[PDB]
Each structure stands twice: as C-alpha cells, then as structure tokens.
Design a protein around this motif. Structure first.
Motif, PDB file in Angstrom:
ATOM      1  N   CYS A   1       0.826  -1.100   0.093  1.00 19.25           N
ATOM      2  CA  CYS A   1      -0.138   0.025  -0.017  1.00 19.25           C
ATOM      3  C   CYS A   1       0.832   1.120   0.068  1.00 19.25           C
ATOM      4  O   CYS A   1       1.867   1.342   0.711  1.00 19.25           O
ATOM      5  CB  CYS A   1      -0.876   0.060   1.117  1.00 19.25           C
ATOM      6  SG  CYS A   1      -2.004   1.382   1.296  1.00 19.25           S
TER       7      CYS A   1
ATOM      8  N   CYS B   1      -7.443   1.489   2.946  1.00 21.71           N
ATOM      9  CA  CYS B   1      -6.967   2.892   2.585  1.00 21.71           C
ATOM     10  C   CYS B   1      -7.798   3.649   1.345  1.00 21.71           C
ATOM     11  O   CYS B   1      -7.566   4.798   1.569  1.00 21.71           O
ATOM     12  CB  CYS B   1      -5.516   2.722   2.559  1.00 21.71           C
ATOM     13  SG  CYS B   1      -4.468   2.577   3.950  1.00 21.71           S
TER      14      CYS B   1
ATOM     15  N   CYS C   1      -4.411   0.189  -0.733  1.00 20.54           N
ATOM     16  CA  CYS C   1      -5.285  -1.198  -0.277  1.00 20.54           C
ATOM     17  C   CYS C   1      -6.736  -0.845  -0.010  1.00 20.54           C
ATOM     18  O   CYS C   1      -7.184   0.322  -0.049  1.00 20.54           O
ATOM     19  CB  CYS C   1      -4.716  -1.879   1.235  1.00 20.54           C
ATOM     20  SG  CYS C   1      -5.245  -0.950   2.796  1.00 20.54           S
TER      21      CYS C   1
ATOM     22  N   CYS D   1       0.065   2.821   6.360  1.00 23.75           N
ATOM     23  CA  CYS D   1      -0.880   1.593   6.247  1.00 23.75           C
ATOM     24  C   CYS D   1      -0.320   0.710   7.152  1.00 23.75           C
ATOM     25  O   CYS D   1       0.930   0.395   7.331  1.00 23.75           O
ATOM     26  CB  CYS D   1      -0.756   0.917   4.966  1.00 23.75           C
ATOM     27  SG  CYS D   1      -1.917  -0.407   4.592  1.00 23.75           S
TER      28      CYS D   1
HETATM   29 ZN   LIG Z   1      -3.315   0.744   3.172  1.00 22.29          ZN
END
Ligand SMILES: [Zn+2]
Ligand SMILES: [Zn+2]
Lengths: 51, 8
Positions: A18, A48, A45, A23
């Motif tokens: 990510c 996120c 991701c 993250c």
């Molecule tokens: Zn993430």
C-alpha cells in the motif's frame, strides 16, 4: 514467521505494498486484493482506498 | 506500484 495482508497469512507469491506509508498492513497477497499483475502507478489497499 | 516476490 511474519504474516501480512488482510488474511494474516505468511508471505507467498507476489505481494503488493500500500502506498500509504502509514498503512498498518502494508503488504497484501495479489490474490487477496484481486490482482494478477502489478498495476502501474500508486496503489492503495481496500481499507486505505475506502472500501 | 510497489511489489515483491516471496523469497525463502
Ligand atoms: Zn493501506
Ligand atoms: Zn492475503
């Protein structure tokens, strides 16, 4: 020993990271995030990205 | 993106 991704499994195959430096998970198995090839550009991701 | 292959 270390586990990653949203599945908390050991590293296997190709992993993608990510692009949010904060993250918590960072690395995900391609399969768990529906990928089969490295995408160009920044990648975030599901959480996120706001999934 | 950033990716890496699993290594033993
Ligand atoms: Zn993430
Ligand atoms: Zn996974």
């Amino acid at each position: 020993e270390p586990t990653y991704c949203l599945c908390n499994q050991v590293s296997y195959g190709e992993m993608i990271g990510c692009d949010n430096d904060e993250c918590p998970i960072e690395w995900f198995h391609f399969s768990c995030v529906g990928l089969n090839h490295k995408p160009k550009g920044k990648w975030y991701c599901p959480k996120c990205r706001g999934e | 993106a950033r990716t890496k292959q699993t290594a033993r």
